[PDB]
Amino acid sequence: QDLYLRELKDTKLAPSTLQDAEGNVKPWNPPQKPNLPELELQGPEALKAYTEQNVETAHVAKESEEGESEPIEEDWLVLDDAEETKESH
C-alpha cells in the first residue's frame, strides 16, 4: 500500500538516519552518539559502584581470631577460673 510503503520509507530511511546511519538527527540538536554511547555508558556504573562495581574492590578474606597460642598465661588463669566456677556445681 502506498500509505504503507511511503510510511515504511519515511520511517526507515529516517530510522536509518537515527540509528542505521551515524548521521544523528538534524531535527534534534544533540546527537545521542555523543550523549549515550560513552558517558551514559557510565550511567550503568553511575547507578552501580563507580570504578568499583565492575572493578569488584579487592577484599581478601582475613583470619579468624584465636588466643595467640598463649598457654603460659591464659591456661593457668583459665584453670583457676573454671575451678572457681566448679565451687557452686
Binding site: 583459665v78 573454671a82 565451687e87
Partner: protein, 85 residues
Amino acid sequence: VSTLIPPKVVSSKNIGSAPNAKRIANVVHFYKSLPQGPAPAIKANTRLARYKAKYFDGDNASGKPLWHFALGIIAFGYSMEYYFH
C-alpha cells in the same frame, strides 16, 4: 572466648570440701573400728577380782550386788561388837 575444659577443673579442687572433711573423718572412724565388737576382756579373778568381775559385772546389776557388801560388813561388825562390847 573460645574452647576450654569447664569440667576438667576438678583437678584444682575435689567436689565437696565439707563432704571431703566428713568423709575423711568417716575413713578414720570406720577403718579404726573393731571387726565385730572385738577386744572384750571381761573375765578377771585374783583375790578381790574374783568378786569384781563377778559381783560388779553388769549381767545382773540387781540389788544383791551391793547387798553383799552389807552382809559382809555385818559379819565384820558382829565380831567387832563381840570383841568390843
